[PDB]
Design a protein around this ligand. Sequence first.
Ligand SMILES: Cc1nc(N)sc1C1=N/C(=N\c2ccc(N3CCOCC3)cc2)N=CC1
Lengths: 296, 4, 258
Amino acid sequence: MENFQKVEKIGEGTYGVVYKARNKLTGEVVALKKIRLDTETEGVPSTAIREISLLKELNHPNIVKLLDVIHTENKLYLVFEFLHQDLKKFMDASALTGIPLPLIKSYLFQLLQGLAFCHSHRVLHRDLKPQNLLINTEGAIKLADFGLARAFGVPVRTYTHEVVTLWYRAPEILLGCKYYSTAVDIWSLGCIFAEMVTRRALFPGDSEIDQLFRIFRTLGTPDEVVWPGVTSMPDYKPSFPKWARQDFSKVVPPLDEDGRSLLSQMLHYDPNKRISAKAALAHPFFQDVTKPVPHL
Amino acid sequence: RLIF
Amino acid sequence: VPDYHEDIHTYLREMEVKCKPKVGYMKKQPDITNSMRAILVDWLVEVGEEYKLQNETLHLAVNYIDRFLSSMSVLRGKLQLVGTAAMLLASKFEEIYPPEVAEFVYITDDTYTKKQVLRMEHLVLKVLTFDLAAPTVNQFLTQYFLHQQPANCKVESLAMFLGELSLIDADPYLKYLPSVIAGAAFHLALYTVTGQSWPESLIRKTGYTLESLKPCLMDLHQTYLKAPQHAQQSIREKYKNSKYHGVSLLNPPETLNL
Ligand SMILES: Cc1nc(N)sc1C1=N/C(=N\c2ccc(N3CCOCC3)cc2)N=CC1
């Protein structure tokens, strides 16, 4: 720790505060996560156990780099490459103008490569939202905050009570599914894509049931044809109101036919049909993708 | 306690 | 969706080699023995029953312990403390909500303090270099099960049983990668239940012919045959549950037709 000079506090996340620091020896700027170790009640928090063990495995241009872990009696320090802001803040700051389409397209393409890498290494992120998506000044975006992430060499069991964000939550989870799959990550990413495009959250629900009904209101109420099984899912009720599917031209106006098509495949109700990250990167939406820099 |  | 199954399988086959324990380690421990390890593992099975922990959590704990004991000498009086910190770590890695540390102290009957367990956790982390996402027999089994025609849930329960039996006996089982043991367990469970055999889907995918599985199979069959006589009985008692179709009551085959 002696080689680091703290510069400023940037925040906290899912647990333990985040500082911009510089290595006094090499000049490298890093982001330090400081974990307060409760060395009498709980020990190393499971978020840090997962983030470290998973990130150490994942080396990819579009996944935040964990540079070092500095492990002391009283303190655990995580050293990450520094990235100067999150998508959520950038979107807030680009509100009224919009994030330019080309940049939207480049971000999505890079997020999908990040995600495809995770999924082909048996890692589910589980918690994708704009606040966990970090950008630099050169036009790159990376997945960050892997404190909720899980290895899925064995299927990941879902949490009776999801502590995991509402707005980007997939309908199979809202409806009481027993396991997660890589399709929940694709659903969130679909939500974030739309939110970049329209400048507001696709599905901003105020409870589990209001979340569902908002999805139903836009994509239409699912049935056995669209999604074999729904009707026998723990939390499915015959009394769900019956909406029809909105046309995506009205959901995402600025989007061309290619974007609309990819988005519709990322938000497929049936987790078995929803497009994989691997496949989405084959989409013709990405034919004219470039690497614009944000006006930060 | 396991005694070994 | 099976978009990533080849990729994950291949990557698990890479990682299992990297997460492999030293095969000859128990002979460099001056104070502990295969037989004490066997007692510790059998106790961890019961702890997992007691707290309704997933099976993956037990396989992970045993991998942490063997990797730990591969480089650190441990006195018999501290072995259960290594085991308790490993189970805590595995629970944090793998469970939705892991038991509290206090609960882990309670389960040794207060033979260590919460502080001791916590410091041991930190030591286990340091020695494993925070590399906790270890492939297990249970993970290779789960993948292998995708290749049943049709899926048979006695076959599934029985192969898990057998794969757990292997955690108990360092000799011979530390000789084999999880993917190989999982291969043997799956064949042996299939053969036991139905008379069928390590399917050709898997021979191609894994590159393991049934012949190559032979040494592990021979050992696993002998373990299966002798299980009702073995000093440690926790896994048998566990797999009598209807949860598991009582597979551990089923009669093992006296020959394997190899
Ligand atoms: C690795 C990591 N994990 C987190 N939970 S945050 C984090 C990192 N953060 C980094 N920088 C920022 C982190 C957060 C932010 N913001 C969040 C708070 O409002 C302002 C923007 C801005 C920059 N750089 C690298 C990693």
